[PDB]
Amino acid sequence: GVVHGVTTVA
Amino acid sequence: GVVHGVTTVA
Amino acid sequence: GVVHGVTTVA
Amino acid sequence: GVVHGVTTVA
Amino acid sequence: GVVHGVTTVA
Amino acid sequence: GVVHGVTTVA
Amino acid sequence: GVVHGVTTVA
Amino acid sequence: GVVHGVTTVA
Amino acid sequence: GVVHGVTTVA
Amino acid sequence: GVVHGVTTVA
Numbered sequence A, B, C, D, E, F, G, H, I, J: 001g002v003v004h005g006v007t008t009v010a
Helices: none
Strands: A002-009 B002-009 C002-009 D002-009 E002-009 F002-009 G002-009 H002-009 I002-009 J002-009
Touching: A002 E002, A002 F002, B002 D002, B002 E002, C002 D002, F002 H002, G002 H002, G002 J002, I002 J002
Parallel strands: A002 B002, A002 H002, B002 C002, D002 E002, E002 F002, F002 G002, G002 I002, H002 J002
Antiparallel strands: none
């Protein structure tokens, strides 16, 4: 797999 | 798989 | 699969 | 906000 | 904010 | 903010 | 902020 | 796998 | 801030 | 695997 630009902001 | 630009903002 | 631009805003 | 259980599977 | 259980799987 | 259990698997 | 259990596996 | 740009901000 | 259990595995 | 730019800010 590829994961690019995964953002989690609280 | 590919994941690109997954955003989670609280 | 491909996932591109999945946004979850609370 | 609250975010609980946000799943993204490719 | 609160973020709990945010999963991204490629 | 609080962030608890944020998982990113490629 | 608090961050608890943030996992990134390639 | 590849992981590029995974951001978690509390 | 507090950071507890942040794992990055390649 | 490759991991590039994984940021966790509390």
